[PDB]
Amino acid sequence: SRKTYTLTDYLKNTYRLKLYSLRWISDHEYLYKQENNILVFNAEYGNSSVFLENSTFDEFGHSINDYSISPDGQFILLEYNYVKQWRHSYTASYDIYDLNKRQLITEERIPANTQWVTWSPVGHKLAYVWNNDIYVKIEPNLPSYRITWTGKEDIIYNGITDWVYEEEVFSAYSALWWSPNGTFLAYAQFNDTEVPLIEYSFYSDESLQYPKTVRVPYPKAGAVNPTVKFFVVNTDSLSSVTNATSIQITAPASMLIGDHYLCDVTWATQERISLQWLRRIQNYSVMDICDYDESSGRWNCLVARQHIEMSTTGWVGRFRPSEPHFTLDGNSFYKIISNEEGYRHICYFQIDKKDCTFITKGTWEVIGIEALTSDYLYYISNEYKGMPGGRNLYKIQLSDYTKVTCLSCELNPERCQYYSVSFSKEAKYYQLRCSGPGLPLYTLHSSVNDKGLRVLEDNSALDKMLQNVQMPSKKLDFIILAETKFWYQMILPPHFDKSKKYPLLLDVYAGPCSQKADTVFRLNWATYLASTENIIVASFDGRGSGYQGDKIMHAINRRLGTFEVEDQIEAARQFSKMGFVDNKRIAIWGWSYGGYVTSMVLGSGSGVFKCGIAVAPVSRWEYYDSVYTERYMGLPTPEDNLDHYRNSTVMSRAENFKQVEYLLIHGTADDNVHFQQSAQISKALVDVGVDFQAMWYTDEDHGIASSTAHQHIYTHMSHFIKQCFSLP
Amino acid sequence: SRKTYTLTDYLKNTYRLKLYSLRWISDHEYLYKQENNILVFNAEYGNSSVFLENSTFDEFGHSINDYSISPDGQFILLEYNYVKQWRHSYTASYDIYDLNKRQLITEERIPANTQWVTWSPVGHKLAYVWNNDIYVKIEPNLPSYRITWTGKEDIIYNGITDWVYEEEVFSAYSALWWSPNGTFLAYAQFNDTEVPLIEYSFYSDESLQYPKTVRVPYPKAGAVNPTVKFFVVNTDSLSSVTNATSIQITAPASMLIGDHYLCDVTWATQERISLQWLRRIQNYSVMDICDYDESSGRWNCLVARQHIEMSTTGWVGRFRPSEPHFTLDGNSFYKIISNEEGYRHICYFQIDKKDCTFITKGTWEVIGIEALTSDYLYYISNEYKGMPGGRNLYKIQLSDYTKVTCLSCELNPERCQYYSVSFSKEAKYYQLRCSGPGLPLYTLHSSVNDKGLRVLEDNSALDKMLQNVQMPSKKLDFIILAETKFWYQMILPPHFDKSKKYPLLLDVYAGPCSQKADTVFRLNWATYLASTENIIVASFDGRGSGYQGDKIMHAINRRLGTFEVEDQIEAARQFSKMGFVDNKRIAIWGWSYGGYVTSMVLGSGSGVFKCGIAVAPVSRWEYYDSVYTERYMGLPTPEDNLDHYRNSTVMSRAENFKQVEYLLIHGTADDNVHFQQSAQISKALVDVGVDFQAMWYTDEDHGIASSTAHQHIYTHMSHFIKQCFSLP
Ligand SMILES: *[C@@H]1O[C@H](CO)[C@@H](O[C@@H]2O[C@H](CO)[C@@H](O[C@@H]3O[C@H](CO)[C@@H](O)[C@H](O[C@H]4O[C@H](CO)[C@@H](O)[C@H](O)[C@@H]4O)[C@@H]3O)[C@H](O)[C@H]2NC(C)=O)[C@H](O)[C@H]1NC(C)=O
Ligand SMILES: *[C@@H]1O[C@H](CO)[C@@H](O[C@@H]2O[C@H](CO)[C@@H](O)[C@H](O)[C@H]2NC(C)=O)[C@H](O)[C@H]1NC(C)=O
Ligand SMILES: *[C@@H]1O[C@H](CO)[C@@H](O[C@@H]2O[C@H](CO)[C@@H](O)[C@H](O)[C@H]2NC(C)=O)[C@H](O)[C@H]1NC(C)=O
Ligand SMILES: N[C@H]1CN(c2cc(-c3ccccc3)ncn2)C[C@@H]1N1CCCCC1=O
Ligand SMILES: N[C@H]1CN(c2cc(-c3ccccc3)ncn2)C[C@@H]1N1CCCCC1=O
Ligand SMILES: *[C@@H]1O[C@H](CO)[C@@H](O)[C@H](O)[C@H]1NC(C)=O
Ligand SMILES: *[C@@H]1O[C@H](CO)[C@@H](O)[C@H](O)[C@H]1NC(C)=O
Ligand SMILES: *[C@@H]1O[C@H](CO)[C@@H](O)[C@H](O)[C@H]1NC(C)=O
User: Fold this and answer.
1) Do residues A264 and A276 touch, judged by C-beta distance below 8 A?
2) Shared-domain flag, residues B378 and B476
3) Choosing from A670, A671, A678, A718, which is the catalytic residue?
């Protein structure tokens, strides 16, 4: 045979997966960027035309990072001077171009160093955050109205989140929610006054004589948490002479008694907001329904409308309480709830009524609700062929729950088992996105008869290129551990010989609600290790893994670093039992939570693993943030869960590392899993006389995502793995 | 045949060198700590008596770190709760025990967290520094008198130095000088108001949830330097009702015009102080002679008494201007000055007279002046057998300079070639300390007819143990480079075979005024590499090296990282020509300046070296302190020497590291050569796609001196050297 998938192919993106990233602008039209032009596509017919030529901004004088067309199509917001902050946050410069007048706006521009910009859902109003304060523009050429005056760097945040809310609660920077009409603007206010600061050196460029100290409010497990306030402004009654009036919506009494989080904001109608609150002890959540009082200007939340969601075996939701999906009248909603058997299913709720009705059931889970129309509810689930790592689109008939139709299951069963979807406004058309086991396929469909309209992207160019490469194969199967099915995946080398013994690398994450065994197609480091190095790369989903019910997911509750570590050891013991694995060449590696599990497995003294690599690992739960940690571990106090926080550290296992080859890697500017975590592992290994390998990446964060750093880390880990497996 | 000197022997200090640490307390007596007792010895006869049994402090309740007996013998100052700070500084708790009354002083105790304590030179007065302020106790049981009120943490320092003065100027924490009588107390005041702070994380123990940021005023090359003021207090006229009056002594006009340092304080008589000042441009120093005016209470320094010392080829002195050694009347003195040929010799100066008279000359240098009597001047030099790395004691007859007598040269010429000395007060006796080439020998002698009195320590216990070990040998010789002799040393394996090819490791420092080729006996890492691993460990003294004249030393002036790097490359090329070196197995390593040279040699693209290890290296001169850097490099400005600062970095040679195996090591709490230095090397290597090896040591400083860290680093470097040389 001929060429293999090399490390250089992975690092240099030689074999590009093609995407079809579309933006719906109505119930029947979408925008698409097809090189040097923006095109508008008609979903029913498929005809297109140039919406905007990229030649329009040749004389702009800055590199445009991104754009946003206003809902009415009248304006385009141009984003340039992009400066990345955390996982979702960034700062940028913004300019507005009038599409009808065909010119840039010179007067009353969005200021430089803007934290977040948002168009209203309809029309052309703007809400932006500058210096932690909210500003509203009714028209792009008109002056802004100031909404908040309390904004203070690292202390008060209006309309944007602090570190912990961005990372753990909202999974977004924005804390601004326009009403459907664009009449109201709802926002959250974060107060970090007494939140302790994580401090670290930033070395910057060679030209900087003195390193900079970065100071970030970050609550570690058990520390003072930021507080939250919720407000609503009427953007239609803004005065140029008088200051803007913000109406506060207070949290329920069952929340105000102690520490709590605002975990969800959903507009139900033009005058109704849904708010979900969660206690610091993350097993109790309350949903409030708040209506606008036209004859007072205030917002009232009846105690009778409050819906409580609690857990007896663990925490609420997968990572957070699930979002409600309101019916058009806003008097009822659907939401994914854990049932009496522990499976996550769609529940139907009526506002002034007692409980809920489950509309789905079974030994599988609903992944998410995608669309809701008058007649149907569209959702993604892993029901098909009882594969927890598969994803398909289904629709349930709202007039008969037994009438469920799989929409994606049989489109291409050998090639397509993992779908995601993008619905048009009002769900008239949908784009299906299959990500495996074969090459990604993008298709356009009509909700009317569920007829296929067009193939958008088939990846035929990649298909032909990959026919020319010795590609590895993927086996997706399960093993039995204590009368339960646990899924695993294996990346097997090309020309796989079952009578030959191959070295095995265990790729681990194993965090709560994780899934490493799935039907997704990937071109990654594992692709190179199996194709060029002839190493079996295995992944296993044990106790604590998600999408298989709470019996499996909650098994890890108040006990991180126990069953998920043990289950990785047992998986490797069982893979060793298969006659195609060299029992003397078993390695393990992982990033973030994966790094914590790798380190815990290496310090277990199982004797199964020869070597391992931990990238940016957690080492002790007290060093990680309060929101994520306390969700699974409780508080680190003698009354709560101190004993388990003390017994679940990497440092305490330092003695057992004498039995293994260990490579420890961490970025110095990691704002998420602080360098401190690895600084403590290295110190405990040195204190016990254990030799190991280390690598720091100057100014790299959790992702180690800088082009040169990404290439260096993978090159360094490849040399380590090859040396450990005696490969040339 | 039998056992070799193993890595474990080095790390576990299996073969300990015995010392004879004595403290002269008079012209004929000394103190010696001889197991469970402090003894007093009579030099002439050798008889002794117990002075203090350590059973006295069995019920003290703290571990005594050190002690200090008052000059009059009446009190002992006990040091406990020792907390190390920088190279010289520390904090401790102090208690005073009355030796006559045989009880602890319970009233008016030295406060906890005392920065520095000092007995007066005669009697029992105390001067201590607490919270950056000076305090004086006339008697140990009496209350203190406050001298200064200006003390401010990290800003104003009274009687103690800031970071830069401790490390570079005084090579000591103390900035307090009692007059011989103990009448006056002279002190320096340091002001660090506008000095920029170096900031770095301190991780501490596992129990610390948030890392601490350490902030130290540290001027990097070209930054704002601390300012200095000098004062004198009369300790005999201190009032309990009135505040202490400090008389300020102003720097000369030729110093006040810009930035300057106070570089030396020497009491000449009871009423005369010598002060040496140095300009920020370190080629001009002024010595001031200051006399007490009894009819004014003021100190006056005549401009006619000022002695200027300037350099035309480099900087003043070896590391700083040399100290004056005054004759009893204080009207004349002796100083080591560089002569017209560039050799450092003893100069004789008379106070109200124009220049000086050289009393020594030749192609060798005076290392230091050790004692001065009415008849003789005692000094150490490297004259014997023209060996720059040898050290011997000589005496010159003050009535005839041609009458020079070597006092140590012929005591044991095969065993003893490197001496240091300790004279009694008034120099009636001297202890000679020979540190090689054989095992250290400690002897006592009488000055009258230079008769050997006693052998104090012969190391006979080590001698017998080493007879049982396969010990390596040392060859000390020279090679010619551009018509000049340059010395090198080689640690050769036992049973050395000149017809066999051995791997070579080059051990480097090469800093200005350094010496790595000498006659001293050492039990170190090199001893193990040659004895167990059969590796030749070589060291070379090239351009910039000291004790061979200014032509060699000043060759590197305003050009660090040029000739000393080139000369290490040429030494290895010449060792390669010798037929006992494997030219394919040549490695290089160094610590501090040695790490900078190793990195510069590895990035030179010479192709001579296979691998190298740099421990805590300097990478760019702008990151290192102003005092040391500017001495050799000038200022990093375009009007001065910016072009060489920019051309002499490790980062700029990053491309050439593809040709070598590199191991980079640095401690994270290094307050001297900041971790920033290695953080910038690693980042430049990653930016260029160079794979290398790294190791950080959490909370270790420049020394990486913690027992567990010292063992780990040497174990890690040994594995690296062994794999690079293909050794099992
Ligand atoms: C962000 O959060 C912080 C807390 O982390 C919050 O700051 C707190 O503000 C309040 C009110 O401004 C202050 O509380 C007071 O303390 C001062 C003394 O320092 C007293 O004057 C106060 O007593 C008076 O007022 C009381 C009620 O208002 C009554 O007892 C009586 O009328 C008194 O006259 C009171 O105890 C406090 O200084 C801070 N806390 C901290 C830790 O800084 C801040 O306001 C928040 N910012 C926003 C925009 O929400
Ligand atoms: C798809 O094709 C139709 C039909 O040609 C386009 O609709 C026409 O174009 C303009 C702009 O909307 C109107 O002024 C005409 O009256 C329309 N004619 C008809 C017969 O509908 C349509 O815009 C095309 N869509 C895209 C996205 O290119
Ligand atoms: C060494 O021994 C001598 C002689 O015994 C000691 O000197 C004498 O002893 C006492 C106590 O100091 C004095 O009162 C006598 O006047 C001394 N006589 C002479 C002739 O010196 C001496 O103290 C001993 N030294 C040590 C350090 O033990
Ligand atoms: N901060 C922690 C957050 N996290 C998540 C969060 C989510 C998620 C999915 C849907 C909605 C909201 C959040 N899904 C997967 N992982 C892993 C991460 N983490 C865990 C420990 C180590 C470091 C790290 O970043
Ligand atoms: N700070 C720098 C100071 N230094 C010295 C100083 C002296 C010395 C000798 C007699 C009197 C006063 C000073 N002797 C040898 N080395 C090397 C060191 N240094 C140089 C660069 C790298 C880091 C370091 O500590
Ligand atoms: C939207 O919201 C309010 C009432 O909900 C109304 O007064 C306003 O003018 C509305 N605008 C529309 C429906 O276009
Ligand atoms: C929440 O957790 C605590 C602490 O483990 C527990 O005692 C309590 O019953 C929980 N709440 C619910 C609703 O189960
Ligand atoms: C220290 O120096 C500053 C200028 O940096 C000056 O304002 C201040 O007076 C000084 N303090 C003392 C005690 O000399």
Assistant:
1) yes
2) no
3) A670
